Amino acid sequence: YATVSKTHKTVSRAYGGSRCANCVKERIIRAFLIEEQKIVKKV
Amino acid sequence: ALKVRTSATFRLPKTLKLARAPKYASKAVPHYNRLDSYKVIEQPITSETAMKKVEDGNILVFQVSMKANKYQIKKAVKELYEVDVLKVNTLVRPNGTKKAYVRLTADYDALDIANRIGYI
Amino acid sequence: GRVIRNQRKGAGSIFTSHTRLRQGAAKLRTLDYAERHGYIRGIVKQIVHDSGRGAPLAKVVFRDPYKYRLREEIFIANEGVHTGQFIYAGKKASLNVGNVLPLGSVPEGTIVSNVEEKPGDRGALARASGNYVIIIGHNPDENKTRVRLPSGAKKVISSDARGVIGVIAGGGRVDKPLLKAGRAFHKYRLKRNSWPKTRGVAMNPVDHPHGGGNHQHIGKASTISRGAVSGQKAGLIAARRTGL
Amino acid sequence: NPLTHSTPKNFGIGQAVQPKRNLSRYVKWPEYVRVQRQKKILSIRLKVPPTIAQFQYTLDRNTAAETFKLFNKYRPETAAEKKERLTKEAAAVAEGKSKQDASPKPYAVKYGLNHVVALIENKKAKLVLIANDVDPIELVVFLPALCKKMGVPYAIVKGKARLGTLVNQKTSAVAALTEVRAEDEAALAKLVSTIDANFADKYDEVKKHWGGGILGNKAQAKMDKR
RNA sequence: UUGACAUUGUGAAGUACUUAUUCAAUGAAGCGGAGCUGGAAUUCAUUUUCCACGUUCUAGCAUUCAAGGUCCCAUUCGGGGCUGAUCCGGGUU
RNA sequence: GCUUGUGACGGCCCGUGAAAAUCCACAGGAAGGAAUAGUUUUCAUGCCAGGUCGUACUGAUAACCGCAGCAGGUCUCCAAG
RNA sequence: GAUGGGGAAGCUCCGUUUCAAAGGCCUGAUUUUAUGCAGGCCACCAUCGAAAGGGAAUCCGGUUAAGAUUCCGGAACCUGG
Ligand SMILES: [Cl-]
Ligand SMILES: [Mg+2]
Ligand SMILES: [Mg+2]
Ligand SMILES: [Mg+2]
Ligand SMILES: [Mg+2]
Ligand SMILES: [Mg+2]
Ligand SMILES: [Mg+2]
Ligand SMILES: [Mg+2]
Ligand SMILES: [Mg+2]
Ligand SMILES: [Mg+2]
Numbered sequence: 001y002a003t004v005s006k007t008h009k010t011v012s013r014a015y016g017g018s019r020c021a022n023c024v025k026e027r028i029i030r031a032f033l034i035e036e037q038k039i040v041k042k043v
Numbered sequence: 044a045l046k047v048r049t050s051a052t053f054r055l056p057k058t059l060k061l062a063r064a065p066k067y068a069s070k071a072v073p074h075y076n077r078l079d080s081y082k083v084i085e086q087p088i089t090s091e092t093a094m095k096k097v098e099d100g101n102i103l104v105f106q107v108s109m110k111a112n113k114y115q116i117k118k119a120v121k122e123l124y125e126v127d128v129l130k131v132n133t134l135v136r137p138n139g140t141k142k143a144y145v146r147l148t149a150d151y152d153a154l155d156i157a158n159r160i161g162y163i
Numbered sequence: 164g165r166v167i168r169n170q171r172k173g174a175g176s177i178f179t180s181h182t183r184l185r186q187g188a189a190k191l192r193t194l195d196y197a198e199r200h201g202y203i204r205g206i207v208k209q210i211v212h213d214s215g216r217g218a219p220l221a222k223v224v225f226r227d228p229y230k231y232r233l234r235e236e237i238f239i240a241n242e243g244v245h246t247g248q249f250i251y252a253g254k255k256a257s258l259n260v261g262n263v264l265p266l267g268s269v270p271e272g273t274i275v276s277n278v279e280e281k282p283g284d285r286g287a288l289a290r291a292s293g294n295y296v297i298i299i300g301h302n303p304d305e306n307k308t309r310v311r312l313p314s315g316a317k318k319v320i321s322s323d324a325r326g327v328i329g330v331i332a333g334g335g336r337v338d339k340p341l342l343k344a345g346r347a348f349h350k351y352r353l354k355r356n357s358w359p360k361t362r363g364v365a366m367n368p369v370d371h372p373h374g375g376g377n378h379q380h381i382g383k384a385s386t387i388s389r390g391a392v393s394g395q396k397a398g399l400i401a402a403r404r405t406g407l
Numbered sequence: 408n409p410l411t412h413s414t415p416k417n418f419g420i421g422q423a424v425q426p427k428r429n430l431s432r433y434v435k436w437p438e439y440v441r442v443q444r445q446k447k448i449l450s451i452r453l454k455v456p457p458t459i460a461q462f463q464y465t466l467d468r469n470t471a472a473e474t475f476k477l478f479n480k481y482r483p484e485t486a487a488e489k490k491e492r493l494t495k496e497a498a499a500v501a502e503g504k505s506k507q508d509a510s511p512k513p514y515a516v517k518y519g520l521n522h523v524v525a526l527i528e529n530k531k532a533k534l535v536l537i538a539n540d541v542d543p544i545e546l547v548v549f550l551p552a553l554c555k556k557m558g559v560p561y562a563i564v565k566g567k568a569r570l571g572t573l574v575n576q577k578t579s580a581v582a583a584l585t586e587v588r589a590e591d592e593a594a595l596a597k598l599v600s601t602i603d604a605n606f607a608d609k610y611d612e613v614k615k616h617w618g619g620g621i622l623g624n625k626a627q628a629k630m631d632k633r
Numbered sequence: 634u635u636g637a638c639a640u641u642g643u644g645a646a647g648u649a650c651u652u653a654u655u656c657a658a659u660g661a662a663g664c665g666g667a668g669c670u671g672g673a674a675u676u677c678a679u680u681u682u683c684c685a686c687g688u689u690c691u692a693g694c695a696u697u698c699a700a701g702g703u704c705c706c707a708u709u710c711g712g713g714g715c716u717g718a719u720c721c722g723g724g725u726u
Numbered sequence: 727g728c729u730u731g732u733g734a735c736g737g738c739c740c741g742u743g744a745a746a747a748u749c750c751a752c753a754g755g756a757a758g759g760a761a762u763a764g765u766u767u768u769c770a771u772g773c774c775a776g777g778u779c780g781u782a783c784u785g786a787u788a789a790c791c792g793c794a795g796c797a798g799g800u801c802u803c804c805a806a807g
Numbered sequence: 808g809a810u811g812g813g814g815a816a817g818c819u820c821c822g823u824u825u826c827a828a829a830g831g832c833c834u835g836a837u838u839u840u841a842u843g844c845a846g847g848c849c850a851c852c853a854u855c856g857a858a859a860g861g862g863a864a865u866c867c868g869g870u871u872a873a874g875a876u877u878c879c880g881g882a883a884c885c886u887g888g
Contacts, residue, residue: 201688255688776886
């Protein structure tokens, strides 16, 4: 992997070469919904 | 007050270290070069098999010191004979001596250098 | 005679434990500020098999209170604990399966496992599969708690000793017969070199106190006193009674 | 103003990582430091016999300051100053046929444990200063009783290093005055009366009182609430 | 294994303490006391006391001496105090 | 069809079947950078160097061990009709 | 299997991160000279142990009485700079 270009080792998205698309989708949905729930729990 | 210590671990403090200033020399006479050019190259090898490489392969065969590596052999050949070296291959013979295959560049001929040294 | 078999095990040459495939020592978290004041939440990442241990192990990851990083712990999983479950450990934790609480914060009759003998030793009691500890009473003065052990013994433990709510998973393992010598071989292959076992009466007198004779018999009482020395303690040691 | 925002951090249990605080109380010190502080504790937790406990009382700041002012007027001659005396004495008696008495009689503080003890036994010391910091305490533990029996006023002063400064040494551990110039005689008499009221006159009752027995901070709070 | 003596001190009465010794853990992190805030609570003059004092639908995220507030530098690209984050004792528990 | 490699699956366990060096990606945003000019050596091309020791042959009814040129013993790969 | 420590009259024994003040690469500071001096980072704390485990990178043709994936011819690749 130290001899090939970076384009071979990543995907143009957050968490490109680490997590798949579905897991990234769940991370974004979970992050948004929980933070919204925290606001209504504060009030 | 007291110094604020954010870490509970105590470590050895760094102190000044002085360099040596001896009152007398360790040996007072440096040794001369232990491997000069005349020690790296011992003598050419003049067997029938070695003579064919001189005529055909443009290769000079030498017996060299057991302590010499490929860097030293290349440097010695250039200084002793005023030639250019393409690459050096070495081996340790069954009798305990080291043999070096020295191939010269195309600008030089191994045949005319060999008879200039004196062996054929 | 010569050194008998049970004397040779203390040298620990070929009788050491086989620990290549072990997942790691199963311990609770180190008792820190969060445990004794409030609670800290952990996440179960996976439940894995451990060689040489009947009960499964649970991998729980906590956040480091004083540094930006993650800390991983190896717990003995209780029944009902699943991957992705939040685990709460501390003084102010709730009474739910998998939560770690001190014995003084649970009511009488609570079922607990991986119980600390003393606060901070990270679990000593009720660790084998299917075993548990029952809380039977409390002594608010002098900070003591009475518990019932799997062997039936009653013990008095400090109320600051921690325990895990539930029962160790993997119960009912010993109810299936091994059914052949091969299965016993593979069982002890991952534990230690104690199988097979040769009977002492089948040996020679030089080898075992039960050895020798024109018939295969013991010759003297098999009940041995507590004061006997090494090389004599073969049979039933300090038996209060024998027979069915 | 409209670009900066207030984002307070929650430092509660299970919240954001704790900030860097002062942990000097919890520092794991080297062994020599820990043995140094625990020996100090051990010497006060246990009962102290009166022979040793009498050294906890030291001269107060005002009286000690007055004492050192008088002792500083009788510094021993330095090595450099001794050079001038010898070259002057040599040029005086050797050539001038003198009687080796061309120099005035010196006045200096007497020091040295063996020397001072001999002076006390001969009733020659007018005032003796005793250091309370001598680690092999047996070297100085009997001096208050010896001074009391011989009738020589004594004071337990704070600092063996301080006594060394007035004798051009690192440490002296004892000092004494035998002869004082007439112009300073009245000053010495004021110090003797003040010093006697603190050590010599209280010797009888101090010998009957034990020291030590002090509990730790946590033990003291536990003992109060019981 | 059992007894005696030594290690071996301190307080009381007809068991109590701590300091020696012993056990255990933490790359010795939050111990002890007090002061704040509220809660329960009944006051027989005021608090005679106790509890609590940022985190629990969710397999997300949490790091740059911390943003903010305030006070200085001699203004430049920045820097240094206090507070944020209560005091006191240095007995790591 | 044979030998072998590999893929997706299925059966089995009170047995669930190494470790570390090493390499990469992501999260984070400390710094560093443009207008008469700079950064990219994870895009292409071009330049230099890569030491030291082993390397022949037998591997067995004659090159190893059994007193030996001993019907004994001694790990493994390739496999035609 | 050393060290720090603790045993043993002693040859030596225990122990391997242990009741230890156990160490160095990113730079900034300096154009007296070489690195003293400022923040922060990291505490992992010797070493030995596989020619069948892990592991950066080469192939074909030709050549000798006896060597070759090592020599010759041609064609590639990796690491460091
Ligand atoms: Cl046996
Ligand atoms: Mg070679
Ligand atoms: Mg038999
Ligand atoms: Mg027998
Ligand atoms: Mg018998
Ligand atoms: Mg060969
Ligand atoms: Mg042979
Ligand atoms: Mg050893
Ligand atoms: Mg090695
Ligand atoms: Mg060949």
